[model samples]
Target: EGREDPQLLVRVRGGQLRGIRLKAPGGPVSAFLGIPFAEPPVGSRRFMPPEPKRPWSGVLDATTFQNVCYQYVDTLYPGFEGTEMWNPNRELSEDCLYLNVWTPYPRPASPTPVLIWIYGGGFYSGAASLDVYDGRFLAQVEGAVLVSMNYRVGTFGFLALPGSREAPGNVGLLDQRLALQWVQENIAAFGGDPMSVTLFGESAGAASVGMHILSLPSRSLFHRAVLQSGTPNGPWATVSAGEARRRATLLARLVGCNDTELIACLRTRPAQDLVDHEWHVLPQESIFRFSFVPVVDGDFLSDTPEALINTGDFQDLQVLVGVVKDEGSYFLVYGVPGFSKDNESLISRAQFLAGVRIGVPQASDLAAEAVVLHYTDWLHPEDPTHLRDAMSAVVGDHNVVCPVAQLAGRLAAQGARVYAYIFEHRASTLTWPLWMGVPHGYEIEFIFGLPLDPSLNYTTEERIFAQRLMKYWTNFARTGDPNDPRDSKSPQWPPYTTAAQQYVSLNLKPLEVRRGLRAQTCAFWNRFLPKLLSA
Candidate 1:
């Protein structure tokens, strides 16, 4: 239903862009794709921070998508069909710095609230070009301006040298920073309220949002933030400055480059060669740790992430943070060797202990044993399915679920208006085993209102569920309250507090309030484990 509309034009700092109009579920909307937010990080600019795009003399065509940053494309089940969309289909290139914007058709008479999306990719892979990230539906349905961007990932975006200025670090995030600035300077031309911006993302994108929350310059770019299934200090998604430097040098050696001029030599090599070596150096046991992730950087992130959060500098912002019911199982499907999702394969007790030790790098020898014993003790000793699930819980608790909850509690303590939730609705379209209940990323389709399309094979209940979810997300963008507009009569979602610790259960049975999800297990990871491992 995307039709070219010659008159849908918006003039930005770079130049005028002519976008296409699409018939979304709510109404007609204009989609401006492949808009250059910064000059392509190519040639001498490679691995350096983004420089502002030079203004064009003529109107720029934005009807089609641009190149995605080069990265190796692999799938969860490569042999299986219907997985082609999982990998980016766009041409891969180092010259890839662009973003997409969507607004109501013919431009709203008055500006609407803005919702900027940052996609999830575990810091190494993902593209804004993916069909799932299409912003037309959410923009039209929710009556807001929606945007998403393509930034460099893997080595190109995050390679950090100890003393090099060219590849300082976190250029991926700097790309995002520049995009937000572009919105601030030019969104008014497209009928968006820059003053009421909400930045939201999933996985590494969510971690990026969290890091922006911690950084001084990125904090002022948006009014509210939504973090889905990631945090700044969530397990191995982010690395220490030391670990980042170690990985960069290790990568340089892997590519047959000298360390004396690491950035210069690494840039000359083909991107595919760098990416091929990049994933090989990463630990197979862990799913999210590419190692070349965001660092303290001494500038963008001046202090530890937790220290900044504790300073109460961000208490004034409205935040919505949440995770799926089974965050870990999604990654474990692809991460663990010899495990098959279609076969409903099981993980042995030996694999369980090995996973805890391998996944949690800081676990002491005794602490690792204790962790294995404690988690295994909670399971049905002889049940193979229970043993496999125990491993999933262990990974989920430590990496995603608990860290998000801990961050919510910390924010709640500072009197910040924070909302928390756990998406419990298992997707009817799941290809994974029945046991992989409500795994991570299952909520994304619903968030994007994908179920509203009958041809997508979503059930009637899921169609209704998608509508409810989009309302909840966009309503938070409009007002701090997810149950706004008054006339819609959306169910109420309570603000998170340390004492009560209430959160909503987003499932097909209609929204119900729940209290303290995984309080005991999360406590083990958030409180007891930290104290136990430190000793």
Candidate 2:
């Protein structure tokens, strides 16, 4: 056969109450879509890692999307506009534990590497069913098996209890671990090489990937990892068990439930209550009250990921990690004042809570100065205020960049190959109040090859650049190294080593920036963060 003919059909059994399949671009591929790898996290099982769904008897339809997990339309950010990502009137439910798969040419002989995805919503919201994540292109274009899954979010997933062993902590991490285990056992039937699994994600998902790197339970579940716009160490990334529990209890009370009955009441309450409550719009410092994410559980994540890397726990894995040029700007788009020269309130609150102060002028001026100093070389650089603002977005980098550098340096010291990149593509679709400059999660557009919002119309250059990025990403997926001889147009992406520190800077004017940018800035941050967090 010259080419494979793609088909869409349903899979009837094998523990799936219902499932669907997508053939590779050309022809028949094996897949199981909307399968219950874990039981529906409904009723009494609301806050636990997914239990294996009981096997089904007759054919169940897996063609249409099941109910999406609870998530409010981020009216403030509006990134999902005009895409399936925009669920303005979505109904939330407990029946949200599901996974989808796309495998190309599902034959035992055609064992392809497996790629699993975890979506990012600051650990509060996102779905595996988003049209952007549709893996037809990834499977057909890249020749790999792709899996996307949904984990519990908000109070339903990561709630910790003060004196309760029954409800320990880090249920979200455990949920991811369970999903990977599911892949390890079932991917073979989907024409995937279970042994060659690669786990990759951006933002919160990227943070989860870092956790997976250090997690003993996640060991051998994945062979390689890619993290975009996220780092292992950051003030916002990890929380103490007590802190997690405190937030969870607060959320339960907001919903009008007492502490003891909170879990039970939450299990029965409509998910819309959680979403419609408008919790995400709270002050940036207070969003944790609404979105309960992964916390430090001595059992699941005994130590911080940074500490683990320093101790040589992640020396064996091939790692790819990077941050976008203006990651903070994208996130700041959701903040109360939006991204501005003045983040005084934000920094002062952080310092107040942490009990440390950066020696500077006034708090607001100091806040702006700190971001500009850490992220950009331009001192109040020229307009396009966007460019200047992009530089100031380094505050976001400070939170994630140094930790990533720490991980890379530690692994490199142990002789592991760790490749890093900086994404600097400014989006035409993202201008104005949302002037995202290669901001956080923007690379997702190129990686998934999705159409840019017409509002952010791309120049011909941008379209071509998008194509180049796709080729680079797919090429990387094809081989461990992103630069393959087959990709003639792309520059050679050399493996990162301590001596060479060879890393790519992704842009229309792409080149290799030195590796120590993150390292040097991180040094400043190390001196600054502990006090900042304490303040």
Candidate 3:
């Protein structure tokens, strides 16, 4: 009976939350921001699996966005270097276990499918509060509930120690599982069907979805998933448990603590200290290394991803795996320090070979030779531009493209319903070099219904593309079919199989279906290259 719009208030399990209203293309959207999913993983709870958030006293104001998890903010101005695009510009905190929800206001006539988003920052830094990831538009346009949760990352997220109750591993994945549990138990209050949830994300977040699919209990938490440009056990995204513990021990020593009191001492150190001292103890394992990431715990991840996939040990759910045409083009902007748009100066053949010689897996001459011979076009051997293309291709193929392709095939091989895509459209807004194909994450804006905003100038066709993409996404969440006929107009997206290998190449009107993508290249990277040097 207070002046607040009762329509905006929801009685979730924890307590009542009063959300704010925002206008969207479809209708008014109710946005509940910064709602706690667990007790702040701070103080005594630091570095531990998340515990439940205590029930609140009154109607909690979830109108405003909240703290972003702490990440490396180099004083050297990482922003000036263009990496700031990925950094959370919001207030930072260690107590960052919150989730945000967006639903079509006035509510859907029936409970709508829920889409939960996990972010991607190499398992090091990412937050749900980024403006780019805002769910309001997607929920309103697609007639579904959109949710995003902030999971722990960097040292706070993945530090692994054996048999140590204080710092057991995979707390980050555990945090995600807890959030899934939270949605299952509480989403109905927001007009979301608990049984109809889909987990989706890009890069690190995409890998997290695959990991959740691998977990036995997590299979019951969501019915479908979409993985954009990340794969389970992709070396760029994961390290073995032995390596994880080794890094954890080195981090403890770097933080001036001994093994005896590691957990206790870690709790007392500044969270910033953990994030800052990460790279010092981190060995230069590759041209790029995210210091801390999910490691296989026999509990959460029973075995390696391949071993699990081969044995059919994962959930058989509808899966969508996608990658940008050039998955490593985004890396050129800010992913690696030595390469960026600032240095448009071409990478000579010499420089390209050098980068390959010491790349991922077992960085060896044989590995480098294999990549160089296959990826580089000898027709333009002397062209410095070809070298640049080779460099991006090497990073993209090994880090994201091939691994994702293999994951798709493995899922299909196990008889799981699978779909695949290559996001081929390049947005007109991008300032990236013209030579590169659609950069990683370029599909984000269009899929999020950004074209609906007329204030910004997206091409006429882009708006239609967004509508089609949103329908495909929402259709899949509703019933495991991306081209569900509820919208009858969306083009049919083919199911991917080990042999057929059918996939859609989005945007050239460009939205035509294609057979295999880089079949030989992926075969070499996944089969032959690995046989040469076992990853």
Candidate 4:
């Protein structure tokens, strides 16, 4: 376990490169880090689709991580200042479009299935090189090709202009697509089978995966998809460009800039300064208040993802989609509360948002009765504060449940195979424990099999639950189905179709939740969604 050969150096098209040879569980392993997938997207290239990096001369040492994408890191999240989630006192730069790959066996002829990951940061900030995303555990532990990448964030990634022809919005999606194209053309050298690639992501990353499945250019680039805690529908009142531009114009006036030159000056300003000032211009509701989001641009996204998928517009790729049970528990920190039995205020807000008149009999009964039955004490046991926290989870499910469940149902109705699940374990490291049950993305740490950071603790039962979930994920990667008969303890998962509608529940003991709550949610979403338009 301790033998290491001398550093191996080679000259390649990009540059001279150096890597280390070491023993891996599978055999010998080699890794290259900080590889540039695209040329720096700064200055003239700003806000544009990624440009491929130019070739280098002799070699480049690729053993270390590159700079993180530009972000405040701490101020971006609630109570993030004192935690490890705070940005390391490291440098940030515009030249942050890079990716890293970990191969179990790098023989050119081996040809293993490849799995590329897109990190989640609400579409504003996150890097491929984060410590939490290290691919070693996934690659070495699961025997698959693993990749992580970085993309522009905030104003840099999601800006849109009325008359600009040089760059369109959704550069974030374009960045992810370009990375997939790169893997298709070059992953063979690292012993990955380019043709058998699977794309996976959580939260905003999951939303990106959903977008890729609906894109014309991105069609056929991936064979499978995995989405966690994300949805295709939200009010879009916050990140919508119409709203963003209106706010940006106001901020421009406050900062003393010409309305005519605001777009040009804003593009070139230092990233942090823009972040600091832009906060005042955005809404004060959630993380997306000041963040940019993927817009329904005519070219890249001709229609909303929901419209595309509903009308059989996406590729016929197998999909895995679901949400954590206590999904919205963490949003309480943002001052945006959810709907729960005790929170009459929040339930009133939901009814208002749902546009149901107070005197309507059905609406009143649904609001009053549904809350008590669904938000049961069994789901939340800590205290009255815990009950308040459960509102976000309920709302998260309300927002994501119908849309994602409808996506699966649509696929099933069309005779496509689909597997769905609900992850039920809650992590101890949740922000504001009083308000966080399972939270939004508690599944990520367990899926990657990373040692729980000291801050995140799990009981023995929860640890066992994490192992089963990881097994389900890796097994799904190996085959199209997540069922693992080898584990005598886990439940047998059945394929979901319109009639049977079976789904797996990831908990202390995995079980089948047949004819589950998904049907109700999907029916609601189908009725709510607007009809698709012909391109």
Overall lDDT per candidate, in order of appearance = 0.78, 0.61, 0.78, 0.60
Could you estimate the TM-score for every candidate? 0.95, 0.81, 0.95, 0.80
Error of 3 at 134 (Å): 1.0
Q: Candidates sorted by lDDT, descending order?
A: 3, 1, 2, 4
lDDT of 4 by residue, 256-370 (tens): 5433367666666677775566546544333323346676675666676656666763335677777777655544444443332223333334432332221111223445344
Q: Which digits, one per residue and each the tens of the lDDT, describe model 2 over residues 1-535?
A: 1132233333323543333455333454455556666788776776655677667766555554555666655665355452235342324655776677776644335777888887766666767777656665566556668887777665566666634543566666677777788789877766778888877777777878887877788878988887776655565556677776666666666776534477677556677675554353222342212346667776677777667777854556777777777666544433323234233222323332121112111124455446444444355343334333433344455555666666667766775567787777765665433344465677776666443222336676666666566566655555655666665554676666766665778777755556563655666665564455455
Model 2: per-residue Cα lDDT at residue 192: 76
Cα displacement (angstroms), candidate 1, residue 357, comes to 2.6
> What stretches of model 3 exceed 4 Å from their correct place?
74-82, 258-260, 285-288, 313-315, 333-338, 343-345, 486-490, 508-510
Looking at candidate 3, what is the lDDT of residue 40?
93
Worst 10 residues of 2 by lDDT: 353-362
- Over the full model, what C-alpha lDDT does candidate 2 score relative to the true structure? 0.61
Candidate 1 Cα misplacement greater than 4 A, ranges: 1-6, 79-83, 258-260, 485-490
What tens-digit string does per-residue lDDT give for candidate 3 at 414-510?
8778888888888776656666678777777776777777665887888888777787777788888788675446467888888989888878473
* lDDT score for candidate 3 against the true structure: 0.78
Worst 10 residues of 3 by lDDT: 74-83
